[PDB]
Design a protein around this motif. Structure first.
Motif, PDB file in Angstrom:
ATOM      1  N   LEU A  58       2.036 -27.588 -14.086  1.00  8.64           N
ATOM      2  CA  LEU A  58       3.375 -27.096 -13.780  1.00  8.64           C
ATOM      3  C   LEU A  58       3.321 -25.968 -12.758  1.00  8.64           C
ATOM      4  CD1 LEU A  58       6.385 -27.090 -14.211  1.00  8.64           C
ATOM      5  CD2 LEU A  58       6.052 -25.584 -16.181  1.00  8.64           C
ATOM      6  N   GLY A 109      -3.052 -34.235 -18.915  1.00  8.61           N
ATOM      7  CA  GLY A 109      -2.179 -33.108 -19.170  1.00  8.61           C
ATOM      8  C   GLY A 109      -2.164 -32.640 -20.605  1.00  8.61           C
ATOM      9  N   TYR A 110      -3.152 -33.044 -21.399  1.00  4.44           N
ATOM     10  CA  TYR A 110      -3.203 -32.692 -22.814  1.00  4.44           C
ATOM     11  C   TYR A 110      -3.466 -31.199 -22.956  1.00  4.44           C
ATOM     12  CZ  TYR A 110      -5.664 -31.815 -27.203  1.00  4.44           C
ATOM     13  OH  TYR A 110      -6.107 -31.270 -28.385  1.00  4.44           O
ATOM     14  N   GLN A 111      -2.477 -30.470 -23.478  1.00  3.58           N
ATOM     15  CA  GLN A 111      -2.562 -29.020 -23.663  1.00  3.58           C
ATOM     16  C   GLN A 111      -2.851 -28.295 -22.352  1.00  3.58           C
ATOM     17  OE1 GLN A 111      -5.370 -28.195 -26.787  1.00  3.58           O
ATOM     18  NE2 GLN A 111      -4.105 -29.132 -28.388  1.00  3.58           N
ATOM     19  N   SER A 112      -2.440 -28.890 -21.229  1.00  4.36           N
ATOM     20  CA  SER A 112      -2.661 -28.289 -19.920  1.00  4.36           C
ATOM     21  C   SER A 112      -1.437 -28.439 -19.028  1.00  4.36           C
ATOM     22  CB  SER A 112      -3.882 -28.900 -19.232  1.00  4.36           C
ATOM     23  OG  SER A 112      -3.654 -30.262 -18.920  1.00  4.36           O
ATOM     24  N   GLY A 113      -0.255 -28.590 -19.627  1.00  4.53           N
ATOM     25  CA  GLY A 113       0.957 -28.690 -18.835  1.00  4.53           C
ATOM     26  C   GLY A 113       1.235 -27.442 -18.021  1.00  4.53           C
ATOM     27  N   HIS A 114       0.718 -26.298 -18.470  1.00 11.08           N
ATOM     28  CA  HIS A 114       0.950 -25.042 -17.764  1.00 11.08           C
ATOM     29  C   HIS A 114       0.320 -25.061 -16.377  1.00 11.08           C
ATOM     30  CE1 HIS A 114      -2.292 -24.883 -20.803  1.00 11.08           C
ATOM     31  NE2 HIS A 114      -3.020 -24.434 -19.797  1.00 11.08           N
TER      32      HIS A 114
END
Ligand SMILES: Nc1nc2c(ncn2[C@@H]2O[C@H](COP(=O)(O)OP(=O)(O)OP(=O)(O)O)[C@@H](O)[C@H]2O)c(=O)[nH]1
Lengths: 222, 441, 39
Positions: free
Chosen positions: A24, A16-21
Motif C-alpha cells: 500500500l 500480500g499475506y500480512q504485508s498489505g502495509h
C-alpha cells in the motif's frame, strides 16, 4: 535454511499475506508514476520507478533475502493478455511484474512454474489493490474538498449530481471490497492456513512442493 | 498515515493515559517507552509509526499532544507515565487551574494561546511526512474541554483542509449540570456539524449502566469508564495498528461507515470483554453486538434505522458462523430502500506481544452503527437546552471575552446552534425515508 | 435386472478432477515442458 521464514517472506511478497502495509505504501508513493506509465507507451522512461523500487529495497532489512533479491520488470503484455496466453480465455495497462532468481539449492524446490504463478497472482493483487486505492482516493477527494461538501444556490445538484455519484461510489465500494474480503478469506486465508499446517513435521519436500502447487491450482481453478 | 491524538480536558487526559497504557501493553512498549521486545528479531506485523515516534534510543514516544486548562491532571498523568510522554508535547495554556465550565472561557483560552498549539502541531507534523489526520479526545459536557475542542477544530479545518479530522466525544449522563453542560455540547456540536469530519458518540448514563453491569461493584469510577473508552478506541484502531491485507487506513473505515459528511456520528458497541472462560461464539458475539445492552450509547429505540454498519471481530473465527450471523442480522436489521444493506466484517488479529486478557480464547467483536439512536440523544440534549434557555436567561452571567462584552451575540450563537442541530436531525430523520434519495429516482 | 446407474457424486468428483487435471496439464505444457527424452 529455515524454510518457514522463506515461505513467510514469499507469502508477504507475492500474496500480500500480512504485508498489505508495504505494498500500500509503494502504491501510494507512485500512483502518478503507475498511471503515467500505463497511459504512455513502452518508450516512456520508467527509470524513476525503478530507482524508487531499489531505494525501497535498500531501506528493507538485509536479512529478508526474498525482499533483498526482489527485482522489478516491465512486460510487453497486459495481465489478461498473459492469462489468455496460458489459459483459453479472451481479454496497454498493468505491464509491471516482479521476479526472484531462486538460487541453488533452493531452486530445485522453488521451480519456475511456481514463480510464474506467483507473478500472476501478484499482478492480480496489484490490480485489485490499485483499484481499491483509487476508490479510497476518490472518497478522500469527495469528503475532504470543500466544494464537494459545499451546497447552495437552490442546489438541485447536490441531491441529483453529488448524492447520486456518492451512492454510486458506495456501490462500487460494496462490490470491490466485498469481493476482496471474500477472496482473501475463503481462498487466501484458507490456503495460507493449509500451507502453515502442512509443514508441521514434514515427510517429503517433493510432497511439500506438490501441496504448494496444488494450493496455487485451487487458487487458479476457482 | 500518521495520526495525532488530542487529549482535551481532564476526561481527555484520563482516557489518553488509559489508551496509551493499553497500546504500550499491546505493542510491548510499557510505561517507559522503551521497546519491550528483544533486539534479535526485527520482523513485526503491527505499525507503531502512526501512533509512536521511535528515536535513536528506540523509545516510542506517544504521538499525542495534551491540551487542558487544568495542569494538575496533566502533571498526574505525567507522574504515572514518567519517561513515557514528551514534556514538549504538553500544553496547559500557562494560565493555572481551570475556571468556569462554560464554552466561552474554553474557546477564549483556545483563541488566546492558539499560536503555541499551532507551533506544537506543526512541529509534530514536520517530524514525519506521511500524515493523515488527528484524533480528538474530549467531553462535550466539559466547558473548557468543549471550548478547546471547538477552537482546535476551527484551526484544523481552516489550516489543514486536506487532513481528515475525527473526534471522540462523550455526552453526559442524566444529571443536574447539563442545564449548562448541554450548552457547551450544542456549541461544540455546532462545530461538529461544520468542521468535524467524523465523530464517535457516547452517552455517560448508558456507559455507567453497562460498566455497573460488567463490573462487580456498582460504584463505577470514572477511571473505569475511561478504561472502557480506551478499550473501544484500541479495538477500532486494531485494523490500523494490526493491518494484514484488507484495512490499512481509517479513511477506508470512514468510507465504509460514513456515506456523507452530514452524517458522521457513529454509535459503537463492543462485546464480550473484561476490564475467565469463553461462552460467546462469533454468532453470539454478533447477536450481542446487536443487543442494546452492549452498545456504548443509550439506544432508546424499538427499531433504529441502520444506514451503514461495519464490524470487526477479534479472535480466530471460522467463516461459517460469520455467514450464519450475517444472514440472521440481515433478517434482523432493517435498511432504507434507497440505501444499501451493506454489512462488512474485519478479522482483527490478536497481538502476540500483548498480555492475555481475562476470558482467554473468547472471541469478541466491535461494531460501529449509523442509525437514528444518536439523533435521539441529540434530541434529548437539544430539548434540555431549549427548556433551560427559553425558560431561564441565566447563561448571560458566565461569559468571557467577546461573549462577556455582549450577551445578545451569545443568545444568537445559541439560537444558531439550535437551528443547525435542528437541520441536522431533520436531515437524519429524512434519510430514514425512502424519499430521501427521491431526487434521482 | 437392469444396468445400475452411474453414481451422481462419482460423476461430479470425476468432472471436477478432470477439469483440474486438464488445467494442470495445460499449465505444465505451457511452462517450458520439463518432460524430455534424449539420445
Ligand atoms: N467517563 C468519564 N468522563 C469524564 C471523566 N472526567 C471528566 N469527564 C466528563 O467531563 C464532564 C465534566 O466536565 P469536566 O471534566 O470537569 O470538564 P470542564 O467542565 O471543562 O472542567 P475541566 O476539565 O477541569 O477544565 C463530565 O460530564 C464527564 O462526562 C472521566 O474520568 N471519565
Amino acid at each position: 535454511y529455515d524454510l518457514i521464514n522463506v515461505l513467510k517472506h514469499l507469502q508477504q511478497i507475492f500474496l500480500g499475506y500480512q504485508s498489505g502495509h508495504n505494498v500500500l505504501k509503494f502504491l501510494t508513493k507512485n500512483m502518478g508514476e503507475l498511471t503515467k506509465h500505463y497511459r504512455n507507451d513502452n518508450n516512456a522512461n520508467y527509470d524513476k520507478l525503478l530507482q524508487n523500487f531499489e531505494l525501497e529495497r535498500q531501506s528493507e532489512n538485509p536479512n529478508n533475502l526474498m525482499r533483498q533479491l526482489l527485482m522489478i520488470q516491465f512486460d510487453t503484455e497486459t495481465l489478461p493478455q498473459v492469462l489468455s496466453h496460458y489459459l483459453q480465455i479472451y481479454p496497454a495497462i498493468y505491464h509491471l511484474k516482479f521476479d526472484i532468481n531462486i538460487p541453488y539449492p533452493l531452486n530445485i524446490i522453488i521451480s519456475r512454474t511456481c514463480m510464474i504463478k506467483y507473478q500472476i497472482i501478484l499482478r492480480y493483487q496489484l490490480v485489485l489493490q490499485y483499484h481499491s486505492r483509487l476508490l479510497d482516493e476518490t472518497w478522500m477527494d469527495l469528503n475532504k474538498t470543500p466544494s464537494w461538501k459545499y451546497r447552495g444556490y437552490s442546489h438541485t445538484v447536490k441531491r441529483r449530481i453529488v448524492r447520486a455519484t456518492r451512492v454510486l461510489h458506495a456501490k462500487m465500494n460494496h462490490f470491490i471490497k466485498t469481493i476482496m474480503e471474500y477472496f482473501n478469506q475463503n481462498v487466501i486465508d484458507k490456503e495460507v492456513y493449509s500451507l502453515e499446517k502442512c509443514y508441521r513435521n514434514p515427510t517429503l519436500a517433493v510432497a511439500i512442493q506438490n501441496e504448494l502447487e496444488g494450493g496455487l491450482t485451487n487458487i487458479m481453478t476457482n | 498515515g500518521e495520526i495525532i491524538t488530542l487529549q482535551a480536558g481532564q476526561c481527555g487526559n484520563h482516557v489518553g493515559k488509559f489508551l496509551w497504557s493499553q497500546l504500550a501493553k499491546e505493542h510491548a512498549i510499557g510505561t517507559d517507552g522503551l521497546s519491550q521486545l528483544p533486539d534479535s528479531s526485527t520482523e513485526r506485523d503491527d505499525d507503531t509509526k502512526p501512533f509512536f515516534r521511535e528515536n535513536s534510543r528506540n523509545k516510542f514516544t506517544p504521538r499525542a499532544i495534551m491540551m487542558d486548562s487544568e495542569p494538575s491532571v496533566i502533571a498526574d498523568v505525567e507522574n504515572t507515565f514518567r519517561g513515557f510522554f514528551d514534556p514538549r508535547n504538553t500544553w496547559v495554556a500557562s494560565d493555572g487551574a481551570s475556571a468556569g465550565n462554560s464554552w466561552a472561557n474554553g474557546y477564549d483560552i483556545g483563541t488566546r494561546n492558539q499560536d503555541d498549539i499551532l507551533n506544537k502541531i506543526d512541529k509534530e507534523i514536520d517530524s514525519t511526512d506521511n500524515f493523515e489526520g488527528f484524533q480528538l479526545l474530549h467531553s462535550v459536557a466539559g466547558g473548557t474541554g468543549s471550548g478547546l475542542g471547538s477552537n482546535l477544530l476551527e484551526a484544523l479545518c481552516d489550516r489543514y483542509p486536506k487532513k481528515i479530522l475525527t473526534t471522540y466525544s462523550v455526552f453526559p449522563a442524566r444529571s443536574s449540570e447539563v442545564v449548562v453542560q448541554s450548552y457547551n455540547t450544542i456549541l461544540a456540536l455546532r462545530r461538529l456539524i461544520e468542521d468535524s469530519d467524523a465523530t464517535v458518540v457516547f452517552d455517560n448514563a448508558s456507559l455507567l449502566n453497562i460498566s455497573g453491569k460488567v463490573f462487580r461493584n456498582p460504584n463505577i469510577d470514572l477511571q473505569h469508564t475511561n478504561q472502557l473508552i480506551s478499550t473501544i478506541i484500541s479495538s477500532v484502531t486494531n485494523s490500523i495498528r494490526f493491518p494484514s491485507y484488507m484495512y490499512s487506513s481509517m479513511s477506508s473505515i470512514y468510507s465504509t461507515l460514513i456515506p456523507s459528511p452530514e452524517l458522521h456520528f457513529l454509535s459503537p458497541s463492543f462485546t464480550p470483554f473484561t476490564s475467565a472462560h469463553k461462552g460467546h461464539s462469533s454468532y453470539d458475539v454478533m447477536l450481542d453486538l446487536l443487543d442494546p445492552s452492549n452498545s456504548l450509547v443509550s439506544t432508546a429505540m424499538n427499531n433504529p434505522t441502520y444506514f451503514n454498519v461495519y464490524n470487526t471481530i477479534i479472535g480466530n473465527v471460522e467463516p461459517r458462523q460469520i455467514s450464519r450471523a450475517m444472514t440472521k442480522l440481515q433478517q434482523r436489521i432493517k435498511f432504507p430502500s434507497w440505501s444499501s444493506s451493506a454489512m462488512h466484517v474485519n478479522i482483527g488479529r490478536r497481538s502476540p506481544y500483548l498480555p492475555l486478557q481475562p476470558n482467554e480464547n473468547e472471541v469478541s467483536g466491535m461494531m460501529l452503527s449509523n442509525m437514528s439512536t444518536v439523533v435521539n440523544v441529540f434530541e434529548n440534549a437539544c430539548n434540555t437546552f431549549d427548556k433551560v434557555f427559553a425558560k431561564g436567561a441565566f447563561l448571560n452571567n458566565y461569559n468571557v471575552g467577546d461573549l462577556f462584552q455582549s450577551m445578545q451575540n451569545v443568545q444568537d450563537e445559541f439560537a444558531e446552534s439550535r437551528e443547525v442541530v435542528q437541520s441536522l436531525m431533520e436531515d437524519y430523520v429524512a434519510a430514514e425515508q425512502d424519499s430521501y434519495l427521491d431526487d434521482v429516482l | 435386472d437392469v444396468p445400475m446407474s452411474q453414481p451422481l457424486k462419482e460423476q461430479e468428483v470425476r468432472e471436477h478432477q478432470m477439469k483440474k487435471e486438464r488445467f494442470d496439464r495445460a499449465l505444465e505444457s505451457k511452462l517450458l515442458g520439463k518432460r524430455h527424452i534424449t539420445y
